[PDB]
């Protein structure tokens, strides 16, 4: 019973994208077992952001995933010690967004500390011109490599009727000893990250659902 049906979240984020320094703080809630969560993010320095917050949204919670088919849950097994994630996202028009995150549990409150370095976003591109309209839903590929949980994803940024593709390369590291966890095998995480509200490039509300599953396609003989 270390995680509850209803969890509080506090997030601190600091970074630079294309030389622009910013800091963000967020508060949220969700059901880790139902795989649902929302969050409110304030830009506290470098407002207004001169780039689409869409690139920061996936930096903002892997404890909140509905696990199907008895798939071992790397993230929840990691408490009370918690876990980190590190990701590089390559954008097909040239942006590169690297982030390192820390997850901790204090009573009922998950604590997120994120560092974000963004480089070579094209000045004319939809990130730096803030023309994006959110993410399509996605499916992460999750597999083990010596007690590290690995992530790969293809994500599509809405740019009117066009889609800008980026590529996620993620490592999830337990702060619990490897020998104390059941590692999952290869599996999938459906993720749907929605921006519900935004104001003056300084305030954002997010909503995310996540489900760990195997392929629904049957395997032949």
């Amino acid at each position: 019973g270390l995680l509850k049906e209803s969890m509080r979240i506090k997030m601190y984020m600091e970074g630079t994208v294309n030389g622009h320094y910013f800091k963000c703080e967020g508060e949220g809630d969700g059901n880790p077992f139902a795989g649902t969560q929302s969050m409110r993010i304030h830009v506290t320095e470098g407002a207004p952001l001169p780039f689409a917050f869409d690139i920061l949204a996936p930096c903002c919670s892997r404890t909140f995933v509905h696990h199907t088919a008895e798939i071992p849950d790397f993230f929840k097994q990691s408490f009370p010690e918690g876990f980190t994630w590190e990701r590089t996202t390559t954008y097909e028009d040239g942006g590169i967004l690297t982030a390192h995150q820390d997850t901790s549990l204090e009573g009922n409150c998950l604590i997120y500390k994120v560092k974000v370095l963004g480089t070579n976003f094209p000045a004319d591109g939809p990130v730096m011109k803030n023309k994006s309209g959110g993410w399509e839903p996605s499916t992460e590929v999750v597999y083990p490599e010596n007690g590290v949980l690995c992530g790969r994803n293809v994500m599509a940024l809405k740019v009117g009727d066009r889609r800008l593709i980026c590529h996620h390369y993620t490592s999830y590291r337990s702060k619990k000893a490897v020998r104390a966890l059941t590692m999952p095998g290869f599996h999938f995480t459906d993720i749907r990250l929605q921006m519900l509200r935004k104001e003056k490039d300084e305030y954002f509300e997010l909503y995310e659902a996540s489900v760990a599953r195997y392929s629904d396609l049957p395997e032949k003989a």
Copy 2:
């Protein structure tokens, strides 16, 4: 109609991988509406293949996808003219495989003509040492870009307990005038590609099932 619920397939492939010339021929069949098919392939020049056939298997059939949710079918709509596909697969240990394909229809035989270039596969990697154990199931991301259907994918090659990750960049081009197609929107194609039999690095048997669908995840308002 034009496509029957039972189709035959003839494949001709020519290519070079790390300087090793090979030709293949396939004979196959499938229910294009059910999204199921199978294929026997003979390596007719350069057998025994000095690398894992696993890299060529996804070069061997996008007419055979079960479409859910009234998703327009780019492929089936393209007949009688048919379509081409072109792909680059990047392997995270350095291998690149580029292939162009032509799909034609005579009677109730789909004809595939495939050209393949493999470059910079590492000598001691599992493709060139032929130590792969087939593919995980996958989910392609499919989206229009002005008459062109685009595909992106993360696939996972089995190398024992480890997974070798590769990235698909696909373009699908109709030979029907773009005025005469209903383009789909952004969607996913589940793909499970199985190797049922291999012999002497010369004879292979493939089976594949594909479903076009939306995300299983509900959208909040």
Copy 3:
């Protein structure tokens, strides 16, 4: 006297870029010791080319390099059997070009056979719109890997006052027994590829100079 002060060149090139099939032929000559050479190219099929021939110029001659500082010449030592090259070129705006080449010798004719596959060039980019204006000079990084000579390069495509960057990944394979060659160590090859004339996307003249060298920077102790 296998390789003369004056050598003739003949090239055969076949390929497809974004669906467009074409063949080209080249006739050339050079001094392979001076590292200078030229080539006339005619599109024999698929003329007029609907993309910049700029992407095909680097597929048109590594026998022609001035070697400084007693650097072992992998290419010249390969005769009479000769050598192959395989290259994938990734453009920062989405294009991939993959190519395999065979180089053989008969008397004083070098015979080039090239297969090219181009994928996912953006419809709106300078290559498919044919708005490029040739290559900056370049320096290739060349280093051995177990009998194979590897090449890495950043090249810059002129687009008025902008530069479209692409990345070369090249493997040079001798058809001569490894043990008959002195493999060079790590070194650079300065290449300047110039397009002297073009005519209705059908006829092209190239000149190229290549120099193999060490860094011109002193090493400290």
Copy 4:
């Protein structure tokens, strides 16, 4: 004359590489006109470093570049305000090193502030096993893109007689208003970074030389 034939350097570095947090501090001196400089680095937190310092070494000085051929010096023209640099470095065996740097001037001392995030370096690979033997010399490609100086590079990390290849993507931003500089054209920067001394994987001496120049190769008419 803010800039003289002898300047001093102080560097602060903070980062995480594969989840290992560290800090370093640098003390150096140089002749920014002759393009020569040296730095002493102490690992001040998270010593002993459990990865190759060689990956941080190019995070430790673009003010120190001898400009030939009257090429405009973006770096020198950007004082007193100074400049930033942001780089992502992709290693062909999976590692990514993103970095943001601030360069300031306080009298005769250049002040470097570096944030570093490294993700997804292979546990088995020579970086996390600390088995690299320094860098080959390099040639950076430098070119303007509307007030930003872009850099691209291929660099080779020594691993015995093997070379591990990485790819630099750099943007240099003046903190001086863009319109107050003469932007250079496309040019090259020769860089030779040497580690002269290491101790206890907590103390390191770097020497570097840099020359800005055009191609050594002549242009035909």
